[PDB]
Each structure stands twice: as structure tokens, then as C-alpha cells.
Design a protein around this ligand. Sequence first.
Ligand SMILES: CC(C)N1CCC(NC(=O)c2cc3ccccc3n2CC(=O)Nc2ccc(Cl)cc2)CC1
Ligand SMILES: [Ca+2]
Lengths: 234, 52
Amino acid sequence: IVGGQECKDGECPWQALLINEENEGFCGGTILSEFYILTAAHCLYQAKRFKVRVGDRNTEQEEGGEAVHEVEVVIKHNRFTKETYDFDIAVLRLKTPITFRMNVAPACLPERDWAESTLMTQKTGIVSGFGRTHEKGRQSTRLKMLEVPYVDRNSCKLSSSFIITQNMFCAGYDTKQEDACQGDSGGPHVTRFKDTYFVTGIVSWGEGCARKGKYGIYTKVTAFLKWIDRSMKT
Amino acid sequence: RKLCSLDNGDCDQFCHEEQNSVVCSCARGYTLADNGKACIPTGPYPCGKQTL
Ligand SMILES: CC(C)N1CCC(NC(=O)c2cc3ccccc3n2CC(=O)Nc2ccc(Cl)cc2)CC1
Ligand SMILES: [Ca+2]
């Protein structure tokens, strides 16, 4: 997260952290239910074996509300491709359920049609993670959140040197040095509506971080809702 | 702006137009309130809420 503010006690309970064998956070996650985590498809290649930590805001000082969970099942969208990063989405089934508490709560899943004409038509969404605070910088030890505006679909594509498929959408700023970054991938992108937060995107990728004329690219969650329910059902 | 196009059909959450009439519904963990508009959390820690 380049810029933004740190998630204050309670502000980002649906955040989830994917850690490797060395307890180093390498990707983000979104709590969907006591058993299911949502994350970027490409994050699965970042480490051979990983667990999921929840209820953490400071990676170096136990807030006593943290909790590690072993991943039991990994459901990667079969159409994912490291070539264009299309279908960058995957669900995780946890061996043990999540015990909701102060900084551990699920983010709601909306209905496609409503989400598209109301949530995605809002002015801004929220993105958060333990990612880098600068492009060449290092991982953050403090959980962060950034308010990123929705970027017009046209401008979006015109600014991307890479292709922007129908499963992605731009967000962030044209020049303002605020944007998600490495480590935030697979992280949450939620839109707020009447004091209720709805999942609306997965942190996917981007050309650099906060680079002028470049936006942040998120997986269009409303395009995999039917797929996300099937995966959870079984 | 008509129906759901107008202030979300006054729904707390999901709003869908069915026969020139509004119809509200809530995400898993909520139940439609009496007014068929608001959404009441079913148990503790309902989805989409900051534990502030
Ligand atoms: C196949 C093609 C599409 N390709 C996919 C991978 C993508 N690379 C990155 O993505 C990327 C790698 C990387 C490593 C260190 C620092 C930043 C990095 N970014 C940038 C980064 O991670 N930035 C960033 C910003 C906003 C959001 Cl939402 C998510 C990520 C480059 C394009
Ligand atoms: Ca901690």
C-alpha cells in the first residue's frame, strides 16, 4: 500500500495474510466465511506451502487477536494464465473454522447485478494489505488501507500497456502517489454501502506502483460470484 | 431515476426491480426487516461490518 493510512483497530477485519514457511507475508486475502478465503490466482505460485493468518495489523508484536490457519483445499480457477493474469482468482478452504472477533470478520459477497450498477458505480472503493509502501521499498509491518477511486473503463485500457480483459477493472489514481503494491496482491478491494462493506475485487497487478498514467488492476469479483459460490458449496 | 435507480429503492442492501416495483433482499447473515427494506444481522459478527 503506497500512501493511505494504517487500518485502525477494527477497520479492516476481513483482511487475511498468506505466509510462507518462514512466516513472511507474501500475499493478501479476504475472509468470506469461517472456512473460505478469497485471493489472487497468481499468489499460489509465490510459495510452495503457505498458511493463512487473520486478525493481525502489526506483523511484529502480537495483538493477541491473530490466528494462523492451515489451508486444506486450494481452488484455483482453471482458466488462469500467467501470461495475461486473466482469471486471477482462487478460493481457499481452511482446515479449521475462523473464530470471528475484534479484527476478524468476513466481508459480504454481493449479487452480480446490484454490485455492478450500484457498488461499482460508487466513487471509491477501499484496498488494503501488508504490501510495499513504495515500489522499490520493502514489505509493510503495519496493515494498511487506501481509498482508491474507480477508474473509467476506457481510460483504464488506454493507460495499460498490457491487455485489460473483462475479468479485471482499474482503480486508483492517475498521478497521485497512492496505489496498492507488491504483497497486497490477492488482497481485498471492498466498496462501502450504507455502513456495510461488500467485496468487489481482488488485488491483481499493475505496471509498477502509483506510477503516473498507470492504475491498479483488480480482479472483477462480480464476474466470478457464481463461481465463488460453487467452490464454497463443495 | 426510478425504482432501484432512485436511492437504491430505499433498500439497506440488494435492490432489484420486479414488475415496476421495488424488492429488497440481504446478503447471507442478514434477514429482511419488517419494512421489507432494512437488513437485520442474524448473529454476531455479520459480514461487511467493521468491529469498531
Ligand atoms: C502478465 C502481466 C499482466 N503482468 C502481471 C505481473 C505484473 N507485475 C506486477 O504486478 C508487479 C510485480 C512486482 C514486483 C515488485 C514490486 C511491484 C510489482 N508489480 C506491480 C504491482 O504489484 N503493483 C500493483 C499495483 C496495484 C494493484 Cl491493485 C496490484 C499490484 C506485471 C504485468
Ligand atoms: Ca501481531
